[PDB]
Design a protein around this ligand. Structure first.
Ligand SMILES: *[C@@H]1O[C@H](CO)[C@@H](O[C@@H]2O[C@H](CO)[C@@H](O)[C@H](O)[C@H]2NC(C)=O)[C@H](O)[C@H]1NC(C)=O
Ligand SMILES: *C1O[C@H](CO)[C@@H](O)[C@H](O)[C@H]1NC(C)=O
Ligand SMILES: *[C@@H]1O[C@H](CO)[C@@H](O)[C@H](O)[C@H]1NC(C)=O
Ligand SMILES: *[C@@H]1O[C@H](CO)[C@@H](O)[C@H](O)[C@H]1NC(C)=O
Ligand SMILES: *[C@@H]1O[C@H](CO)[C@@H](O)[C@H](O)[C@H]1NC(C)=O
Ligand SMILES: *[C@@H]1O[C@H](CO)[C@@H](O)[C@H](O)[C@H]1NC(C)=O
Ligand SMILES: *[C@@H]1O[C@H](CO)[C@@H](O)[C@H](O)[C@H]1NC(C)=O
Ligand SMILES: *[C@H]1O[C@H](CO)[C@@H](O)[C@H](O)[C@H]1NC(C)=O
Length: 549
C-alpha cells in the first residue's frame, strides 16, 4: 500500500514535463500524499487522482504550497491541462494552494479552497487559468472540479463547539474528533479520521505502533510480541519494504552511523556494535601497490577492523626513503592498528620503532588467517627487531594456516613458554622457525617469564593481562586470583572461569554468594523491590503489556 497499487506517497508527488498521452493510471488508487503535489510543465488533459483525500504538506513547495499547478500548456499545439480531477480531496494539512498560468484549466475558481485548507493563513493563489470554461452542474451548488454531475466539491468544515479544538464532525459538543485525528473526521472513533496525527495501524489512528515487547503476567517481565509492528513514518507495517531495514522500532533506508545489519531468525535488524562497526580494508604485499605500510599509506587504515590480505612493516617503510621522498613514519601513527581484529593473510614485521618494546598496537588482533603466506610459507614473521622485549599479542587466539618465524629479535623474551599448538591449528610438526632471540637462560634471570597466574600455555609478555589463559579466573582479559564472590565493590559470579557483575541492583550479601548469574531472576536477595522471580527498581508504574497499561 505504501510507496515512494500505491496508496500512500511517502514524500512529494512531483509530475513535471509529461506528454499529452501519458498513462497516469498508477496514481488512481492514491489516498494520501505526505509532502506536496507539484504539477508543472506538462501537456496531459486531466490529472486523475480519484482517491486523493489528503495532502499533508509536512514538506511544502516554494515555502507555502501543498499544491503547485503551473504552466501546464504549450502554444504550438492544443495539448494542455483541462481538469484537476481531485474529486475526493478532503483536506490539506499544512500549506496553501497555487494554481496559476494553466491556459486551459477549468473550474479552479469555483472551489472553496479555504474549506479544504487547515492552515488559517495559508497562501491561496488561484488565477490566470481557463477562460471559456463551462458552468458547474446545478447539483454542485457553485463548486466543481468538473463539468459533470459527479465532479462536485462538497464542503467538509463545520463551525465548532468549544470542547472540540477545531476538530469535529458536526456542530455539537458531542461530535468531537478523536484526539488522534490530524484534521477532520466522520465519526468519534480512531477509524473515522480523514488522516492520522501520528501512525496508522491497519485502520486505527494510533499514537505508537504495537510495541516490540509486551509485559507478561506469567513471567513478570517483558517478552517478544507476535503482534508487533514497525513504523514507516505513517504506516504501521508487518514487514519493511524489500529495500529497507529495521532500526529499533522504525523502518529505515540504512543503519545509523553506529550500527550494523545483523541477520537473525528471519529478520534483518540494526544492532549496536559497541566500539566500532567492522570496516574491511586492503592489505599490503602480493596483490597491492604497497610492499610496506609507510608514511603515504597509514591513513588508509584508520578505524579498520579487518585487513583483507597482509600487513608488512619493512625498514624503508619506517625510516622513510630519502631518494624517492617517502618520509619516515611518525611512530605514534601506528596506533591506527589498535582497531584491527583480523588479518586475512600474514603479518610480517621487520622493522619497529625503537622506543616501542612490543607489538601492543595489535593488542586487539585476534586472528591471523594465513589466507596468504610470506616467505617459505610464514603466516607470522617477526624478524631482527632489535629493541623488542615482548610480542604483546594479548588477544591472538588463532593462526589458521601457515608457519611461524620469530628470529633474531635480540632482546625478545616471554616467548619461550608459549604453546603454539593452542594458537596455530593444523599439524605442529615443522611449522616453527624460532631462534636467536633473547636466550631463555638470560630471560629467566632478569625474571622475564610468565606471571604465576598464567596457565602452562605461556604469555605474550609480562603481567597478568598477557596470558594465553588463566590458572584460576579472569576479569576483562586479566588473570585474577578470585572473583568478587563474597566481597569487593562490584559483586560477581563465574561462568566458565570469568567474572561478570551481579544484576545492577541485587543486595550485596556479606560472605555469601550474591548471585549465580546475570538477570534479576537469580539474585539471592533484592536491594529494592521484587516481582515474581525478578528484582526490580521502580515498581511497574503502569502495566504496559498484554492489553492496556
Ligand atoms: C610494552 O612497551 C611499551 C612501550 O615501550 C611499555 O610502556 C612503557 O613502560 C615503562 C615501564 O616499564 C614506562 O615507564 C614507559 O614510560 C612506558 N612507555 C610508553 C610511552 O608506553 C610497556 O611497558 C610494555 N607493555 C607491556 C606489554 O609489557
Ligand atoms: C599445548 O596444548 C595442547 C592442547 O591445548 C596440548 O596437546 C599440549 O599437551 C600442550 N603442550 C604441552 C606443554 O604439553
Ligand atoms: C489507515 O489504514 C488503512 C489500511 O488499509 C486505510 O485503508 C485507511 O484508509 C487509512 N486511514 C487513514 C489514512 O487515516
Ligand atoms: C572513526 O570512529 C571515530 C569514533 O566513532 C570517529 O570519531 C571518526 O569519525 C571515525 N573516523 C573515520 C575516518 O572513520
Ligand atoms: C634499543 O636497544 C638497545 C640495546 O639494548 C638499547 O641500548 C637502546 O637504547 C634501545 N633504544 C631504545 C630507545 O629503546
Ligand atoms: C589458582 O590455581 C592454583 C594452581 O592450581 C591453585 O593451587 C591456587 O590455590 C589457585 N588460587 C586461587 C585463589 O584459587
Ligand atoms: C544458579 O546457577 C546454577 C546453574 O545455572 C544452578 O545450579 C543453581 O540452581 C542456580 N541458583 C538458583 C537461584 O537456583
Ligand atoms: C581494543 O582495545 C582498544 C582500547 O583503546 C580499542 O581502541 C579497540 O576498539 C578494541 N577493539 C576490540 C576488538 O576490543
Amino acid at each position: 500500500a505504501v510507496c515512494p497499487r500505491c496508496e500512500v506517497v511517502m514524500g512529494n508527488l512531483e509530475i513535471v514535463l509529461t506528454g499529452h498521452n501519458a498513462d497516469l493510471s498508477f496514481l488512481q488508487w492514491v489516498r494520501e500524499v505526505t509532502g506536496y503535489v507539484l504539477v508543472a510543465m506538462n501537456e496531459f488533459s486531466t490529472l486523475p487522482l480519484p482517491n486523493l483525500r489528503v495532502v499533508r504538506g509536512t514538506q511544502v513547495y516554494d515555502g507555502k504550497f501543498a499544491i503547485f499547478v503551473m504552466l501546464n500548456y504549450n502554444t504550438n499545439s492544443s495539448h494542455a491541462l483541462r481538469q484537476l480531477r481531485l474529486t475526493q480531496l478532503t483536506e490539506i494539512l499544512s500549506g496553501g494552494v497555487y494554481i496559476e498560468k494553466n491556459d486551459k484549466l477549468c473550474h479552479m475558481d469555483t472551489i472553496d479552497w479555504r474549506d479544504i485548507v487547515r492552515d488559517r493563513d495559508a497562501e491561496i493563489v488561484v488565477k490566470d487559468n481557463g477562460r471559456s470554461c463551462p458552468p458547474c452542474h446545478e447539483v454542485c451548488k457553485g463548486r466543481c472540479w468538473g463539468p459533470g454531475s459527479e465532479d462536485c466539491q462538497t464542503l467538509t468544515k463545520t463551525i465548532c463547539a468549544p470542547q472540540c479544538n477545531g476538530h469535529c464532525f458536526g456542530p455539537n459538543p458531542n461530535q468531537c474528533c478523536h484526539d488522534e485525528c490530524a484534521g477532520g473526521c466522520s465519526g468519534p472513533q480512531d477509524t473515522d479520521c480523514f488522516a492520522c496525527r501520528h501512525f496508522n495501524d491497519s485502520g486505527a489512528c494510533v499514537p505508537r505502533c504495537p510495541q516490540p515487547l509486551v509485559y507478561n503476567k506469567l513471567t513478570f517481565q517483558l517478552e517478544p510480541n507476535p503482534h508487533t509492528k514497525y513504523q514507516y513514518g505513517g504506516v504501521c507495517v508487518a514487514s519493511c519494504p524489500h529495500n529497507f531495514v529495521v532500526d529499533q522500532t522504525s523502518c529505515v533506508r540504512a543503519c545509523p552511523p553506529d550500527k550494523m545489519e545483523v541477520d537473525k531468525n528471519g529478520l534483518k535488524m540494526c544492532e549496536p556494535c559497541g566500539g566500532l562497526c567492522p570496516k574491511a580494508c586492503e592489505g599490503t604485499g602480493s596483490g597491492s601497490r604497497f610492499q610496506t605500510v609507510d608514511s603515504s599509506n597509514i591513513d588508509g587504515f584508520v578505524n579498520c577492523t579487518k585487513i583483507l590480505g597482509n600487513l608488512d612493516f619493512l625498514i624503508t617503510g619506517l625510516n622513510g626513503d630519502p631518494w624517492h621522498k617517502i618520509p619516515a613514519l611518525d611512530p605514534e601513527k601506528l596506533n591506527v592498528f589498535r582497531t584491527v581484529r583480523e588479518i586475512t593473510g600474514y603479518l610480517n614485521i621487520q622493522s619497529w620503532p625503537p622506543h616501542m618494546h612490543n607489538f601492543s598496537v595489535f593488542s586487539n588482533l585476534t586472528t591471523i588467517g594465513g589466507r596468504s603466506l610470506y616467505n617459505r610459507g610464514f603466516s607470522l614473521l617477526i624478524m631482527k627487531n632489535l629493541n623488542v622485549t615482548s610480542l604483546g599479542f594479548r588477544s591472538l587466539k588463532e593462526i589458521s594456516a601457515g608457519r611461524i618465524y620469530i628470529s633474531a629479535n635480540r632482546q625478545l623474551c616471554y616467548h619461550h613458554s608459549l604453546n603454539w599448538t593452542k594458537v596455530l591449528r593444523g599439524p605442529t610438526e615443522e611449522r616453527l622457525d624460532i631462534k636467536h632471540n633473547r636466550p631463555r637462560r638470560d630471560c629467566v634471570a632478569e625474571g622475564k617469564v610468565c606471571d604465576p597466574l598464567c596457565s602452562s600455555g605461556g604469555c605474550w609478555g609480562p603481567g597478568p593481562g598477557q596470558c594465553l589463559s588463566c590458572r584460576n579466573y579472569s576479569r576483562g582479559g586479566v588473570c585474577v586470583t578470585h572473583c568478587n564472590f563474597l566481597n569487593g565493590e562490584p559483586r560477581e559470579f563465574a561462568h566458565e572461569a570469568e567474572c561478570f557483575s551481579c544484576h545492577p541492583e541485587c543486595q550485596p550479601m556479606e560472605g555469601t554468594a550474591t548471585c549465580n548469574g546475570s538477570g534479576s531472576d537469580t539474585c539471592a536477595q533484592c536491594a529494592h523491590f521484587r516481582d515474581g522471580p525478578h528484582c526490580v527498581s521502580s515498581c511497574p508504574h503502569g502495566v504496559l503489556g498484554a492489553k492496556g497499561p
